[PDB]
């Protein structure tokens, strides 16, 4: 009854997630485990392989570490746009005050970016360029000191998050819960957001009980991952300020400028 409506909501979110995000976790894991008929991704594991694959997985004369860092930022821009399209499919979201929709995305998108990045990661590297490339974790760690630790916190989160074995159906609801967070700074009307989130949280709990019946306390673990993601984003913002106060001539995409403006 209420339960049936919660399954219909879960399915609606899954279907909209499929519409919004071209590279799902299911498709990504198939590439990572080599169980797909598609062409294998080009592996970037050192400076030589970067040179060989850079143009295919995409001139300028920036140092390698800066080209990699800024490429990651451009992927983030595309992710923000996909997440925005997904948010608009969450029932109730587009009827919220428009300034509150902006606030929810501004303070939520990076948490979602990290969540979905885990889908593209294993302990050894990350899929890039819509799955056409694979950049190793060791190569990213080898970059000059300001940039050599930029991805490592994301890998650390991802290995632990991926141990929970969530699928795309689980992730669709988890992401929606995060977007509909009523405690973001400057929200004008918190109650309608909390009401939507309460229903999404009920849908998530039922999804996890049905889809992960042997995974004790998985719901509580995911609530804790939401808290962890906020701390991860905070640390990332700190690293960016460092990168800004030590590096020079670093163009930042205007969409990221809006999101990072504090």
């Amino acid at each position: 009854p209420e339960s049936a409506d919660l399954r219909a909501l879960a399915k609606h979110l899954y279907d909209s997630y499929i519409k919004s995000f071209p590279l799902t976790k299911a498709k990504a894991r198939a590439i990572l485990t080599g169980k797909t008929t598609d062409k294998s991704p080009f592996v970037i594991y050192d400076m030589n392989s970067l040179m060989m694959g850079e143009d295919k997985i995409k001139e300028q004369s920036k140092e390698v570490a800066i080209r990699i860092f800024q490429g990651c930022q451009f992927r983030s821009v595309e992710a923000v746009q996909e997440i925005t399209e997904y948010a608009k499919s969450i029932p109730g979201f587009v009827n919220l005050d428009l300034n509150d929709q902006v606030t929810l995305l501004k303070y939520g998108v990076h948490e979602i970016i990290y969540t979905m990045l885990a889908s593209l990661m294993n302990k050894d590297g990350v899929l890039i360029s819509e799955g056409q490339g694979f950049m190793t974790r060791e190569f990213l760690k080898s970059l000059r000191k300001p940039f050599g630790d930029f991805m490592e916190p994301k890998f650390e989160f991802a290995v632990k998050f991926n141990a929970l074995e969530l699928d795309d159906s689980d992730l669709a609801i988890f992401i929606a819960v995060i977007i509909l967070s009523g405690d973001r700074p400057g929200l004008l009307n918190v109650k309608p957001i909390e009401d939507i989130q309460d229903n999404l949280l009920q849908a998530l709990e039922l999804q996890l009980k049905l889809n992960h019946p042997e995974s004790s306390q998985l719901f509580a673990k995911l609530l804790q991952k939401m808290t962890d993601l906020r701390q991860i984003v905070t640390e990332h913002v700190q690293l960016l300020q460092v990168i800004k106060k030590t590096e020079t001539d670093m163009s930042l995409h205007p969409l990221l400028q809006e999101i990072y403006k504090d």
Binding site: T84, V102, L255, E258, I259
Partner: peptide, 11 residues
């Protein structure tokens, strides 16, 4: 102006 607002309004 807000770029996020523009994305939110573009159907």
């Amino acid at each position: 102006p807000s770029l996020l607002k523009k994305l939110l309004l573009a159907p």
